[PDB]
RNA sequence: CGCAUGCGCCCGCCGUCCGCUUGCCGACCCGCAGUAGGGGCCUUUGGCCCCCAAGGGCACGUGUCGUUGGCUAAGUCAUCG
RNA sequence: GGCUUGUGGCAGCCAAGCGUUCAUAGCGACGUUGCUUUUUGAUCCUUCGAUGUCGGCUCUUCCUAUCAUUGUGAAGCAGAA
RNA sequence: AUUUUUGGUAAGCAGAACUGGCGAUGCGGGAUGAACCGGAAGCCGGGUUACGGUGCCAAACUGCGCGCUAACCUAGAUCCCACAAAGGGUGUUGGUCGAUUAAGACAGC
C-alpha cells in the first residue's frame, strides 16, 4: 500500500533563550511526499504565522498518520484557499475514499483539472470525516443509496496483458451491458 | 436491456492485471469509477471498474458484510460451482489447462485429435452420400 | 456532474400498438403508420407491460449523462406522445390568407397535394408549394381565405405550412406596413 | 504596386494548352443522358463541311422588330451521306469508370473501312479480319458470336455502335480512308440496344435517322490551323507604341 | 493432405530486422534491433537472452556449391517494452537486410 | 508501435468504421517493417470532427497549389481509397528508397474487389471506432466526404457491395447448413472412440 | 479488337542450365450488421442459454525437404480431362 | 527588405450628451483598449571590386478594410430614395 | 543573456553595473537558428544518465489513472519564440455570499 501523499503531525517550538526559558509548543497537520517537505512546509508555515524561523528554531516530533480503518469507505471534506490567476480565494469541496490519503490525492488532482492550480498554491486549513447526512455535495451524496444500482455504461476493452495483445483480429469486439 | 448491474452482492471477474481471473463480490460502491471488492482470500480494498467484468451471478448479502457472512452466502449461491460449470468460466480453466500441457501429452492429444478428425471425416462423407 | 439515472416514463393508450427495438419505434393506430429512428440519442428504451392490467408505458433513461445529454429524455417522450396524437387523431393546421389590395388567389392541384398562389400583391408569378408526405393542403368553405392542412405527423404538416408561409415572404417593402402573407393561425387536431 | 487602370484579362484560360489536338476527327467527350422509356436511336454522326451560302426567310417572331419581316443569315453546308454500321462495342460500369468489355465486328466489311487499319493499304497483304470473317462460316463460330452478343446484352450498361462513313462517295475529297467512330445508342433496354445494332450489321442508317429539321444540334471537330503565332494574334494583346 | 516439399521440422522462430540502435539524428549499427514472432513484453525476452540467431541470404555467386550466405548473431538484452531485442551480429548487418526475416534458433538452451 | 510481427505473405485489413488516422499510422509502421497490406473497403473509413469540418479541412487543402504552374502538384485526390493513401504517405518517408519501397507494399481498393472477396479481412483494433470514439461525437464516412468533394463512383461502389453481400448470406447459409452436417457426423461418431474422447475432454471449450 | 514476318516466329509435353523476386518453411481459414446490443432453443405477453476477441478452428502436424519392396476398403490432398 | 508604429490609416469598449420625447434608428464628448504597414518618421542589420535611381505605357496575378452587381437583417424603412 | 539600470512611444534602437556565454566550440535537445536547456571533447567496447521525449515520420507505451474542452473562426498542442488587449456569452464546469419553500418555492391553467 503506496499513498503519494502522507499526513504528518509535526512538532516545533522556538529555541530557548534567557527571555523564554520553556517557548510554547506548536504542532501542525500536514500533506506532503515525504518527511522532509513536511518539515519543510512546517517551517513555513511558522515562519509566516508565529514568526520562528528554522535557524532559530527547533524540531521536536513527526509522526505519520495512518487511516484507522482503510476497508471502509468515508466521506472526506476539505476546506483550502488557494491562489488563481488574479486573486486568492477559498474553497469546501467533498471526497469519498477508503483513506483520506486517496481524498486528498483527489482533491489535489480535481484542483489540477478544473481550475489550473499547481500544488505549490494550495493550502488545506481543515479536513474532516463527515457523516452521510451531513454531506453538502450531490456529487457525494448520490451514492449514499442503500440500494445502488447502475450498469457499466464506458468499459475499455483490452487483453489481461500485452502478451495477448495482436495488431489484428479477426472478428470485432463483442460488446453489451 | 443491460442485463447485467454493478450491485452489493454482483460477482465480478478481474480482468485485468496481477489479480487477473480471480472472482471478486462487490460489497460498496465508492464512485462511478471505483468500487469496494471481497473475497474468501483477500482483504476488503476498492478496485477501479475498468478492471472488473460483470458475471451473471449475484448473492444475497448487506453491504460491507463480515468475511464469514460473505463466505457463507457465497457457499450458499455456489458461486464458485456455476462459474466453473459456464462456459465463461470454463474458458479461462480450458486456458490455463492449454499453457500446462507438456510435450508428451501434446503429442497424445495430436494423436487422439488425428484419429477423431479421420473419423469424423469418414461419418461426414458416410451422410453425404446418404 | 453525470447524475447516475435520469429516468422519464409516459402511458400509452390501449388502442395504440408500439413496437421498440434498437432505438427503431413504431406506432400503430386507426388513422395509419408512423415511424421514428431515434438512433441518434445514446439513450435505454424499454416497454413495460402489465400483464394483470395489460397497460402499456415506454421508460426512457439515461445512465450517467449530463445535462446536455439528459435534455433529450423529454424531447423523445414529446415526439412519442406527438407520434401517438397523430396516429389516434391526426394534426390539422390552419392558414389565412392576409392582404390589404390584391386577394390572394389560391388554387388547390389534384389530389389535394398541391397549392397555387398567383396574386400575391399583385404579382405575376406563379408559387407552387407541394405538400409532403401524408399532408393535404384543402380551402376551407366556412372560413373566408383560409387554408386547412391535415394529416398524421405533426413534423411534415407544420412544415409543409412553413413551406407556405415561407413562399410568401414580401421584400423591399416595410413588412410591418405591408402585412401580406399567409400564416398559420391554429394549429389543432383533425378527430 | 495595383495596376493603374483595370481590364479584363485577354483570352481564356478554359482553353489550354493552346497547342495541336491529338486528333484530326472530332471526339464526342460527353454523350447525351440515356432514358431508357425511348425507343433506340442514334445519338451522333460524321459529316464534312462543304461550303456557305445565305439565305432569306420571314422571320415568326411576337414582339421582335423583325416580326413579319425578312432576314437574311449565312449557313453552312455539311454533306451527310449514310453510315454503315460495322460493329457493336458495350461497355461494363465500374468503380473506376466504363471499361471495354468487347467488340463483335460485322462479317463483311468495306474496303474503305479496312484502309483505316493501315498505313500504306496498298503496299500491304490487306490480312485485315480476314481470320475473323471466317467465324461466319462455321456453325461453332456464329455460335460463339451469338454467345458473345448474350454477354453484351448480360454485362453491358452502354451500348455504342460502330460506324464509318463511305467517304469514296464524295469525289471531291481525295480520300479513300473512311472515318470510324464509336456512336451510343439511347433508349430501350440494353438487350433492346444490342438487338438494334446488331440488326443493322452491314446497313446504311441515313442522317435523318438522327436529326431533323429544326433540331438544334453540337458540331465537334478541329479548327483550321495557323502554326507559329505571336501574342498579339494568338490571344489578342494591345500592341505597343510605335517607338 | 498438403503435399508440400520443404523443411520437416522447424526448431527456430522468425525475426523481422527493424533497424539499428539509433537516436533521431545518430545511428550506432553495431547493435541491430530485431522483433521476434510470438514475444510482446520484455518479460518474454528473458527467455531469448543470449539465443543464438542467423541471418540467411543469397549471392550471385556460389560458395561451396551453394549461393547461400549466413552470418551468425546472438540475443543481447531487451529493447524497449514491447518485446523488441537488442542482438549483436560478428559483421554489421547490412542495411538492405531492413524488413528481412532472421531465424532465431533454441541453442544455447537452458532448459 | 513496434510492429506486429507476424510473418505472413499479405494481410488484407477491412477499414469499415476505423479512424483514419489511427489506421494510417498502424500500417504505415506495418508497411515499413516490411508487410504487405491490403486495405479493402476505404470508403467506410470514419473521420472524427464531423463532415462540416473534414469538408472545410479539404476545401483548405484544394486551396494549395502552385500559383504559377498548378499542374505542378500538389495532387487533391478525391477517392476514398486515394486519400487513405495520401494519408499514409504522409506518415511515411516516401521520398527515400525505404519509404518507396514501404509504399510500394500497400494496395487500396473501394468496396471489397475481386479475389479480396472471398479472402478473410481482418480489423485494426486500436483503430476501430467503437473502441477510439465515445457514442455521440461527431464523425463522418470518408465515402460520403469523397462524394461531396467530387467523388462519382459513391453508387456504383453501394450497388456492387450489395451484390456481392448478397453471394456471401447464400455462401455463409450453405456453410451453416455444412456445419450442421459436421455436427450431425460428430455425434454419429462419438460413440467409436471412447479413449480419445476422453483425452480431447479436458482441453474442450 | 484486327493483323502479326518461310534458314523465322508462337503454343503444349519431357531432360538440362541460367537469371529476377517486394525477403517461403503449415508461408491453412470469404457471413452481414451492432456496440444504450446481437444470436439460438422453447413460443405465455413469456422463460432458458451463448457473447465478455482468430485468446478460435482446420490440417499425418509424426519420416534424413523425409530408406528398400508389396497390398490398399473408406477418407483427404494434388495433377489431368 | 528587416525591428518598431511615435505620426498616418482602420476598428472596439463605457455612456455625458445629440437625435420633435428617447443614451445606444443613426451618432458618441470626457476617458480608455486595440489592429495595419498602401503615410511619414526612428534605427543602420544586408548591399559601396555597383541589386539600374521618378512617372507613365503594357501584362499577370493576389488581398479586403465591398464602390457596383447576387442573397439577406435594421431604420426617425408609407412609396421612391 | 538573467537580474540592476539611463535616453527614447518603441525598436532585432542607443548607452552603463555584476556575472556568465558567443567570438575562439564541436556534441544531445529547442523541426530549423552564434548566444536558450543539457553539456563541453584524445581513438574504441560495455553500462547509465542530463535536457528532451515514448501515434507514424523517428529510438522509446496508442502503458496504468482522474477531471476539463467539442471550436458550424484553420479548437488546441510546451522557457527564449516567433504576439494579442479592453469588453462580452442564459456554452459548460467547479466555488463564494444572499433570498423563497411541505403553516406547500417558481411558470400555466
Ligand atoms: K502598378
Ligand atoms: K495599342
Ligand atoms: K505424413
Ligand atoms: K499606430
Ligand atoms: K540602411
Ligand atoms: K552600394
Ligand atoms: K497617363
Ligand atoms: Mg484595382
Ligand atoms: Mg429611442
Ligand atoms: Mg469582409
Ligand atoms: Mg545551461
Ligand atoms: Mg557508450
Given at each position: 500500500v503506496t499513498y503519494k501523499?502522507?499526513?504528518?503531525?509535526?512538532?516545533?517550538?522556538?529555541?530557548?533563550?534567557?527571555?523564554?526559558?520553556?517557548?510554547?509548543?506548536?504542532?501542525?497537520?500536514?500533506?506532503?511526499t515525504?518527511?522532509?517537505?513536511?518539515?519543510?512546509?512546517?517551517?513555513?508555515?511558522?515562519?509566516?504565522?508565529?514568526?520562528?524561523?528554522?535557524?532559530?528554531?527547533?524540531?521536536?516530533?513527526?509522526?505519520?498518520?495512518?487511516?484507522?480503518?482503510?476497508?471502509?469507505?468515508?466521506?472526506?471534506?476539505?476546506?483550502?484557499?488557494?491562489?488563481?490567476?488574479?486573486?486568492?480565494?477559498?474553497?469546501?469541496?467533498?471526497?469519498?475514499?477508503?483513506?483520506?490519503?486517496?481524498?486528498?490525492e483527489?482533491?489535489?488532482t480535481?484542483?489540477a483539472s478544473?481550475?489550473?492550480?499547481?500544488?505549490?498554491?494550495?493550502?488545506?486549513?481543515?479536513?474532516?470525516?463527515?457523516?452521510?447526512?451531513?454531506?453538502?455535495?450531490?456529487?457525494?451524496?448520490?451514492?449514499?443509496?442503500?440500494?445502488?444500482?447502475?450498469?457499466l455504461?464506458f468499459k475499455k476493452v483490452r487483453p489481461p496483458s500485452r502478451k495477448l495483445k495482436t495488431t489484428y483480429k479477426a472478428t470485432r469486439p463483442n460488446l453489451?451491458? | 436491456?443491460?442485463?447485467?448491474?454493478?450491485?452489493?452482492?454482483?460477482?465480478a471477474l478481474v480482468n485485468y492485471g496481477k489479480d487477473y481471473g480471480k472472482?471478486?463480490?462487490?460489497?460498496?460502491?465508492?464512485?462511478?469509477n471505483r468500487?469496494?471488492?471481497?473475497?474468501?482470500?483477500?482483504?476488503?480494498?476498492?478496485i477501479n471498474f475498468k478492471r472488473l467484468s460483470?458475471?451473471?451471478?449475484?448473492?444475497?448479502?448487506?453491504?460491507?458484510?463480515?468475511?464469514?457472512?460473505?463466505?457463507?452466502?457465497?457457499?450458499?449461491?455456489?458461486?464458485?460451482?456455476?462459474?466453473?460449470?459456464?462456459?465463461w468460466?470454463?474458458k479461462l480453466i480450458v486456458q490455463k489447462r492449454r499453457a500446462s500441457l507438456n510435450d508428451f501429452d501434446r503429442f497424445?492429444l495430436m494423436?487422439?485429435?488425428?484419429?477423431?478428425?479421420?473419423?469424423?471425416?469418414?461419418?461426414?462423407?458416410?451422410?453425404?452420400?446418404? | 456532474?453525470?447524475?447516475?439515472?435520469?429516468?422519464?416514463?409516459?402511458?400509452?393508450?390501449?388502442?395504440?400498438?408500439?413496437?421498440?427495438?434498437?432505438?427503431?419505434?413504431?406506432?400503430?393506430?386507426?388513422?395509419?403508420?408512423?415511424?421514428?429512428?431515434?438512433?441518434?440519442?445514446?439513450?435505454?428504451?424499454?416497454?413495460?407491460?402489465?400483464?394483470?392490467?395489460?397497460?402499456?408505458?415506454?421508460?426512457?433513461?439515461?445512465?450517467?449523462?449530463?445535462?446536455?445529454?439528459?435534455?433529450?429524455?423529454?424531447?423523445?417522450?414529446?415526439?412519442?406522445?406527438?407520434?401517438?396524437?397523430?396516429?389516434?387523431?391526426?394534426?390539422?393546421?390552419?392558414?389565412?390568407?392576409?392582404?390589404?389590395?390584391?386577394?390572394?388567389?389560391?388554387?388547390?392541384?389534384?389530389?389535394?397535394?398541391?397549392?397555387?398562389?398567383?396574386?400575391?400583391?399583385?404579382?405575376?408569378?406563379?408559387?407552387?408549394?407541394?405538400?409532403?408526405?401524408?399532408?393535404?393542403?384543402?380551402?376551407?368553405?366556412?372560413?373566408?381565405?383560409?387554408?386547412?392542412?391535415?394529416?398524421?405527423?405533426?413534423?411534415?404538416?407544420?412544415?409543409?405550412?412553413?413551406?407556405?408561409?415561407?413562399?410568401?415572404?414580401?421584400?423591399?417593402?416595410?413588412?410591418?406596413?405591408?402585412?401580406?402573407?399567409?400564416?398559420?393561425?391554429?394549429?389543432?387536431?383533425?378527430? | 504596386?495595383?495596376?493603374?487602370?483595370?481590364?479584363?484579362?485577354?483570352?481564356?484560360?478554359?482553353?489550354?494548352?493552346?497547342?495541336?489536338?491529338?486528333?484530326?476527327?472530332?471526339?464526342?467527350?460527353?454523350?447525351?443522358?440515356?432514358?431508357?422509356?425511348?425507343?433506340?436511336?442514334?445519338?451522333?454522326?460524321?459529316?464534312?463541311?462543304?461550303?456557305?451560302?445565305?439565305?432569306?426567310?420571314?422571320?415568326?417572331?411576337?414582339?421582335?422588330?423583325?416580326?413579319?419581316?425578312?432576314?437574311?443569315?449565312?449557313?453552312?453546308?455539311?454533306?451527310?451521306?449514310?453510315?454503315?454500321?460495322?460493329?457493336?462495342?458495350?461497355?461494363?460500369?465500374?468503380?473506376?469508370?466504363?471499361?471495354?468489355?468487347?467488340?463483335?465486328?460485322?462479317?463483311?466489311?468495306?474496303?474503305?473501312?479496312?484502309?483505316?487499319?493501315?498505313?500504306?493499304?496498298?503496299?500491304?497483304?490487306?490480312?485485315?479480319?480476314?481470320?475473323?470473317?471466317?467465324?461466319?462460316?462455321?456453325?461453332?463460330?456464329?455460335?460463339?458470336?451469338?454467345?458473345?452478343?448474350?454477354?453484351?446484352?448480360?454485362?453491358?450498361?452502354?451500348?455504342?455502335?460502330?460506324?464509318?462513313?463511305?467517304?469514296?462517295?464524295?469525289?471531291?475529297?481525295?480520300?479513300?480512308?473512311?472515318?470510324?467512330?464509336?456512336?451510343?445508342?439511347?433508349?430501350?433496354?440494353?438487350?433492346?440496344?444490342?438487338?438494334?445494332?446488331?440488326?443493322?450489321?452491314?446497313?446504311?442508317?441515313?442522317?435523318?435517322?438522327?436529326?431533323?429539321?429544326?433540331?438544334?444540334?453540337?458540331?465537334?471537330?478541329?479548327?483550321?490551323?495557323?502554326?507559329?503565332?505571336?501574342?498579339?494574334?494568338?490571344?489578342?494583346?494591345?500592341?505597343?507604341?510605335?517607338? | 493432405?498438403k503435399?508440400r516439399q520443404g523443411e520437416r521440422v522447424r526448431l527456430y522462430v522468425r525475426g523481422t530486422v527493424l533497424g539499428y540502435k539509433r537516436s533521431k539524428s545518430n545511428q550506432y549499427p553495431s547493435t541491430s534491433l530485431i522483433q521476434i514472432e510470438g514475444v510482446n513484453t520484455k518479460e518474454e525476452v528473458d527467455w531469448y537472452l543470449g539465443k543464438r540467431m542467423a541471418y540467411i541470404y543469397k549471392a550471385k555467386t556460389?560458395k561451396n556449391?551453394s549461393h547461400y550466405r549466413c552470418i551468425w548473431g546472438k540475443v543481447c538484452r531487451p529493447h524497449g517494452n514491447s518485446g523488441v531485442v537488442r542482438a549483436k551480429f560478428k559483421s554489421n548487418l547490412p542495411p538492405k537486410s531492413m524488413g528481412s526475416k532472421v531465424r532465431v534458433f533454441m541453442y544455447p538452451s537452458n532448459i | 508501435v513496434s510492429g506486429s510481427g507476424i510473418s505472413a505473405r499479405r494481410i488484407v485489413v477491412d477499414a469499415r468504421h476505423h479512424m483514419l488516422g489511427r489506421l494510417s499510422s498502424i500500417l504505415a509502421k506495418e508497411l515499413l517493417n516490411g508487410q504487405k497490406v491490403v486495405v479493402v473497403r476505404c470508403?467506410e473509413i470514419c473521420l472524427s470532427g464531423?463532415?462540416?469540418?473534414?469538408?472545410?479541412?479539404?476545401?483548405?487543402?484544394?486551396?494549395?497549389?502552385?500559383?504559377?504552374?498548378?499542374?505542378?502538384?500538389?495532387?487533391?485526390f478525391?477517392?476514398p481509397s486515394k486519400i487513405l493513401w495520401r494519408t499514409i504517405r504522409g506518415m511515411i518517408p516516401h521520398k527515400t528508397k525505404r519509404g518507396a519501397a514501404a509504399l510500394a507494399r500497400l494496395k487500396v481498393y473501394?468496396?471489397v474487389?475481386?479475389p479480396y472477396?472471398?479472402i478473410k479481412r481482418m480489423v485494426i483494433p486500436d483503430a476501430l471506432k467503437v473502441l477510439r470514439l465515445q457514442?455521440?461525437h461527431?464523425y463522418?464516412?470518408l465515402?460520403?466526404?469523397?462524394?461531396?468533394?467530387?467523388?462519382?463512383?459513391?453508387?456504383?461502389?453501394?450497388?456492387?457491395?450489395?451484390?456481392?453481400?448478397?453471394?456471401?448470406?447464400?455462401?455463409?447459409?450453405?456453410?451453416?447448413?455444412?456445419?450442421?452436417?459436421?455436427?450431425?457426423?460428430?455425434?454419429?461418431?462419438?460413440?467409436?472412440?471412447?479413449?480419445?474422447?476422453?483425452?480431447?475432454?479436458?482441453i474442450?471449450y
Open positions: 501523499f502522507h499526513q504528518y503531525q509535526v512538532v516545533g517550538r522556538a529555541l530557548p533563550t534567557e527571555n523564554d526559558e520553556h517557548p510554547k509548543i506548536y504542532r501542525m497537520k500536514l500533506w506532503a515525504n518527511e522532509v517537505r513536511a518539515k519543510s512546509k512546517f517551517w513555513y508555515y511558522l515562519r509566516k504565522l508565529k514568526k520562528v524561523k528554522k535557524s532559530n528554531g527547533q524540531m521536536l516530533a513527526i509522526n505519520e498518520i495512518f487511516e484507522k480503518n482503510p476497508t471502509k469507505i468515508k466521506n472526506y471534506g476539505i476546506w483550502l484557499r488557494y491562489q488563481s490567476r488574479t486573486g486568492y480565494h477559498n474553497m469546501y469541496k467533498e471526497y469519498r475514499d477508503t483513506t483520506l490519503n486517496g481524498a486528498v483527489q482533491m489535489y480535481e484542483m478544473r481550475h489550473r492550480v499547481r500544488h505549490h498554491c494550495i493550502q488545506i486549513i481543515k479536513t474532516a470525516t463527515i457523516p452521510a447526512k451531513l454531506c453538502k455535495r450531490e456529487s457525494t451524496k448520490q451514492f449514499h443509496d442503500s440500494k445502488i444500482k447502475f450498469p455504461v453489451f451491458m | 436491456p443491460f442485463k447485467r448491474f454493478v450491485e452489493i452482492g454482483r460477482v472472482l471478486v463480490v462487490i460489497v460498496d460502491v465508492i464512485d462511478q468500487a469496494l471488492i471481497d473475497a474468501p482470500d483477500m482483504v476488503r480494498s476498492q460483470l458475471t451473471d451471478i449475484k448473492i444475497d448479502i448487506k453491504r460491507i458484510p463480515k468475511k464469514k457472512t460473505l463466505v457463507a452466502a457465497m457457499e450458499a449461491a455456489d458461486v464458485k460451482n456455476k462459474w466453473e460449470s459456464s462456459s468460466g470454463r497424445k494423436l487422439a485429435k488425428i484419429k477423431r478428425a479421420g473419423v469424423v471425416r469418414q461419418e461426414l462423407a458416410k451422410l453425404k452420400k446418404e | 456532474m453525470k447524475t447516475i439515472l435520469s429516468s422519464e416514463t409516459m402511458d400509452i393508450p390501449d388502442g395504440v400498438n408500439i413496437k421498440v427495438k434498437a432505438k427503431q419505434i413504431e406506432v400503430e393506430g386507426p388513422r395509419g403508420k408512423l415511424t421514428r429512428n431515434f438512433k441518434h440519442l445514446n439513450l435505454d428504451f424499454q416497454l413495460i407491460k402489465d400483464e394483470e392490467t395489460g397497460k402499456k408505458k415506454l421508460k426512457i433513461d439515461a445512465w450517467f449523462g449530463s445535462r446536455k445529454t439528459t435534455a433529450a429524455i423529454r424531447t423523445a417522450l414529446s415526439h412519442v406522445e406527438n407520434l401517438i396524437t397523430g396516429v389516434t387523431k391526426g394534426y390539422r393546421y390552419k392558414m389565412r390568407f392576409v392582404y390589404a389590395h390584391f386577394p390572394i388567389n389560391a388554387s388547390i392541384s389534384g389530389g389535394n397535394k398541391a397549392i397555387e398562389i398567383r396574386n400575391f400583391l399583385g404579382e405575376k408569378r406563379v408559387r407552387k408549394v407541394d405538400m409532403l408526405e401524408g399532408v393535404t393542403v384543402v380551402r376551407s368553405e366556412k372560413v373566408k381565405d383560409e387554408l386547412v392542412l391535415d394529416g398524421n405527423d405533426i413534423e411534415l404538416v407544420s412544415r409543409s405550412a412553413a413551406l407556405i408561409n415561407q413562399k410568401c415572404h414580401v421584400k423591399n417593402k416595410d413588412i410591418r406596413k405591408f402585412l401580406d402573407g399567409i400564416y398559420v393561425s391554429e394549429k389543432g387536431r383533425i378527430v | 504596386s495595383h495596376r493603374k487602370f483595370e481590364h479584363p484579362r485577354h483570352g481564356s484560360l478554359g482553353f489550354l494548352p493552346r497547342k495541336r489536338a491529338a486528333r484530326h476527327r472530332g471526339k464526342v467527350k460527353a454523350f447525351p443522358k440515356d432514358d431508357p422509356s425511348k425507343p433506340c436511336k442514334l445519338t451522333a454522326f460524321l459529316g464534312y463541311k462543304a461550303g456557305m451560302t445565305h439565305i432569306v426567310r420571314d422571320v415568326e417572331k411576337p414582339g421582335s422588330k423583325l416580326h413579319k419581316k425578312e432576314t437574311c443569315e449565312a449557313v453552312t453546308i455539311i454533306e451527310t451521306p449514310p453510315m454503315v454500321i460495322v460493329g457493336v462495342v458495350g461497355y461494363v460500369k465500374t468503380p473506376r469508370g466504363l471499361r471495354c468489355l468487347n467488340t463483335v465486328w460485322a462479317q463483311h466489311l468495306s474496303e474503305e473501312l479496312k484502309r483505316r487499319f493501315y498505313k500504306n493499304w496498298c503496299k500491304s497483304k490487306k490480312k485485315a479480319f480476314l481470320k475473323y470473317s471466317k467465324k461466319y462460316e462455321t456453325d461453332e463460330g456464329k455460335k460463339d458470336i451469338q454467345t458473345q452478343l448474350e454477354k453484351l446484352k448480360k454485362y453491358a450498361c452502354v451500348i455504342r455502335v460502330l460506324a464509318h462513313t463511305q467517304i469514296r462517295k464524295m469525289k471531291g475529297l481525295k480520300q479513300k480512308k473512311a472515318h470510324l467512330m464509336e456512336i451510343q445508342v439511347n433508349g430501350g433496354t440494353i438487350a433492346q440496344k444490342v438487338d438494334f445494332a446488331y440488326g443493322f450489321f452491314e446497313k446504311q442508317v441515313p442522317v435523318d435517322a438522327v436529326f431533323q429539321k429544326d433540331e438544334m444540334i453540337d458540331i465537334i471537330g478541329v479548327t483550321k490551323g495557323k502554326g507559329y503565332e505571336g501574342v498579339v494574334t494568338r490571344w489578342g494583346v494591345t500592341r505597343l507604341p510605335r517607338k | 493432405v503435399g556460389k556449391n | 470508403e464531423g463532415l462540416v469540418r473534414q469538408k472545410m479541412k479539404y476545401l483548405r487543402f484544394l486551396r494549395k497549389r502552385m500559383n504559377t504552374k498548378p499542374s505542378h502538384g500538389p495532387i487533391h478525391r477517392a473501394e468496396g474487389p475481386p472477396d472471398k457514442a455521440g461527431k463522418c464516412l465515402g460520403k466526404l469523397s462524394s461531396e468533394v467530387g467523388w462519382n463512383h459513391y453508387d456504383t461502389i453501394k450497388e456492387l457491395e450489395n451484390k456481392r453481400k448478397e453471394r456471401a448470406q447464400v455462401a455463409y447459409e450453405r456453410r451453416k447448413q455444412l456445419a450442421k452436417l459436421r455436427v450431425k457426423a460428430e455425434k454419429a461418431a462419438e460413440e467409436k472412440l471412447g479413449p480419445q474422447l476422453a483425452i480431447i475432454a479436458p474442450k
